[PDB]
């Protein structure tokens, strides 16, 4: 069955987050992004490695594992590599791991909750330059840019801050190539 | 589709009892669960917010508990005004879903149906229709059946009944059955009877009338 | 302090458009994160959630009918409008609007979002019926007291409110003075498509021909007001 139904069926079973349930998760991401600064400047040098590892750990039980546009870098070996190089740390460094795994579980829920959003924006470009399954690989990519740059303390709403990067990722890809 | 399953769907208790309604959620809604109370012919009224916080100005007999998937409401001492339908609501996901409801009734000793009966008005008759009405005032439980006989001939599909709510004053139910006929069809019979059947009776009661004197 | 009142048509014809309005006081839609939502209750069934709109103009609709719902606000007039297209009898219900608290913020940045998890103030509700049946006031007939109506120590009388459309109708006895022993049954829908209900009152069998009993019938949808005195049957002299 065309993933036009395989995918769409998966996401059509995901629920939208309440206005404040979102803002709460989007904040939890920043807390699991400040705990990555701590779990990075201790185990040795910068963050992104840790972030992707925890992301894979959480991604193991995700309701939606196949996201078009995301460069899933499993590295079947690197897992136990950094997993062990973390689970064994001082008493205090275990609670920051707890914090990071949650802040990263939020980044996932937040993305899943806005998939059927990227699908309705993409649909507003049908019959044009690019096609359905194509646009989504771009919108979903903007969805990741927003969930990364987001900043509740600034005052913006996420539903909007998302649309303003989903559409932007499509109108910068409509340039083709 | 996030489903909110409420149990029991209904229940009975007496003033001063302690009861627990439950609300199970198809998926985790954390603490975003609210409990409302709706009295007949009234808007719902908030009781608990954020799962466990008593809404200000709400009686302290009420309390809520739970998180994620399982929630409960609890009335310490049931009171006269606590008999109503209770609803839960989750506001974690859109759409904010409401539970199916839980009706709460009072207990009491089987009451006897005080049966009366009213022949059609002459004012009504002169309009071409007739309505014979059979009132069953104050009984318990709701269980009761009215049977319409017209000249001993049982009647089906030409009557309609309606039950009031269990009154907080006298916690019983009242029923009103209405048999409708045309003026012409009414002007061909004499004995119009009503055969009530209820637990509070050792035999069916028939508060009948005869359209000669009544 | 907070009051919401819904307003709109008591009856709309199928396939037409239903426009409800929520007027409120005690708060503003310019308040931080505040929301105003719509909930309906079909006859004999449980609450169903419809839509919500916020101070920042964010809005959400129930999936099962988001194609038919539009919600809009007028924060300077303290009103919210819900519009529903292509209605059908299945949309017959009481429609409520309700208020949603915004988060307790440190003036701007949220912190205590606890109070947002409930709809804390509800409007009275408005009864709306979608049908092809035309509006029609009620005839009020007596349920006069008598021998077969007076059993034991106390008599019983009432009023029969016959053939009106649509719901609702309101029944009071002696302008409110009388409430004791008053039973106002729910309306039933007759085979013709018109509603019918009775209201009864039990009184002292020794005060019938002395005390005056009047039932006050109001059916707003047809703007009909009726007052009927219910005196005993002339079954005496
Ligand atoms: N108000 C609404 N909100 C959300 N979804 C809706 C609404 N009204 C209809 N829909 C559904 O959204 C769907 C979008 O099309 P989609 O590609 O999801 O089809 P589908 O669900 O895969 O079809 P099927 O259900 O036969 O498998 C429509 O099929 C429709 O059933």
PDB file of C-alpha atoms and ligand atoms in Angstrom, chain A residues 4-5 8-9 123, chain C residues 62-67, ligand 1:
ATOM      1  CA  UNK A   4       0.313   7.789   1.137  1.00  0.00           C
ATOM      2  CA  UNK A   5      -1.913   5.504   3.211  1.00  0.00           C
ATOM      3  CA  UNK A   8      -1.168   8.986   6.761  1.00  0.00           C
ATOM      4  CA  UNK A   9      -2.871   6.173   8.671  1.00  0.00           C
ATOM      5  CA  UNK A 123      -1.760  19.587   0.945  1.00  0.00           C
TER       6      UNK A 123
ATOM      7  CA  UNK C  62     -13.926  18.875  17.065  1.00  0.00           C
ATOM      8  CA  UNK C  63     -12.685  16.578  14.235  1.00  0.00           C
ATOM      9  CA  UNK C  64     -16.067  14.930  13.614  1.00  0.00           C
ATOM     10  CA  UNK C  65     -17.350  18.301  12.377  1.00  0.00           C
ATOM     11  CA  UNK C  66     -14.546  20.805  11.826  1.00  0.00           C
ATOM     12  CA  UNK C  67     -15.601  21.191   8.186  1.00  0.00           C
TER      13      UNK C  67
HETATM   14  N1  LIG D   1     -13.397  17.582  10.262  1.00  0.00           N
HETATM   15  C1  LIG D   1     -12.427  16.663  10.033  1.00  0.00           C
HETATM   16  N2  LIG D   1     -11.265  16.659  10.725  1.00  0.00           N
HETATM   17  C2  LIG D   1     -10.302  15.746  10.495  1.00  0.00           C
HETATM   18  N3  LIG D   1     -10.406  14.771   9.573  1.00  0.00           N
HETATM   19  C3  LIG D   1     -11.523  14.655   8.810  1.00  0.00           C
HETATM   20  C4  LIG D   1     -12.616  15.620   9.003  1.00  0.00           C
HETATM   21  N4  LIG D   1     -13.587  15.292   8.132  1.00  0.00           N
HETATM   22  C5  LIG D   1     -13.157  14.212   7.436  1.00  0.00           C
HETATM   23  N5  LIG D   1     -11.924  13.841   7.830  1.00  0.00           N
HETATM   24  C6  LIG D   1     -11.163  12.689   7.287  1.00  0.00           C
HETATM   25  O1  LIG D   1      -9.850  13.066   6.865  1.00  0.00           O
HETATM   26  C7  LIG D   1      -9.491  12.172   5.811  1.00  0.00           C
HETATM   27  C8  LIG D   1      -8.346  12.698   4.953  1.00  0.00           C
HETATM   28  O2  LIG D   1      -8.105  11.702   3.962  1.00  0.00           O
HETATM   29  P1  LIG D   1      -7.150  10.440   4.274  1.00  0.00           P
HETATM   30  O3  LIG D   1      -6.012  10.433   3.283  1.00  0.00           O
HETATM   31  O4  LIG D   1      -6.875  10.425   5.759  1.00  0.00           O
HETATM   32  O5  LIG D   1      -8.125   9.195   3.946  1.00  0.00           O
HETATM   33  P2  LIG D   1      -8.131   7.865   4.862  1.00  0.00           P
HETATM   34  O6  LIG D   1      -8.531   8.259   6.265  1.00  0.00           O
HETATM   35  O7  LIG D   1      -6.840   7.117   4.632  1.00  0.00           O
HETATM   36  O8  LIG D   1      -9.332   6.992   4.234  1.00  0.00           O
HETATM   37  P3  LIG D   1      -9.886   5.675   4.980  1.00  0.00           P
HETATM   38  O9  LIG D   1     -10.491   6.201   6.260  1.00  0.00           O
HETATM   39  O10 LIG D   1     -10.891   5.105   4.009  1.00  0.00           O
HETATM   40  O11 LIG D   1      -8.663   4.812   5.179  1.00  0.00           O
HETATM   41  C9  LIG D   1     -10.779  11.919   5.037  1.00  0.00           C
HETATM   42  O12 LIG D   1     -10.818  10.587   4.519  1.00  0.00           O
HETATM   43  C10 LIG D   1     -11.874  12.114   6.068  1.00  0.00           C
HETATM   44  O13 LIG D   1     -12.479  10.857   6.383  1.00  0.00           O
END
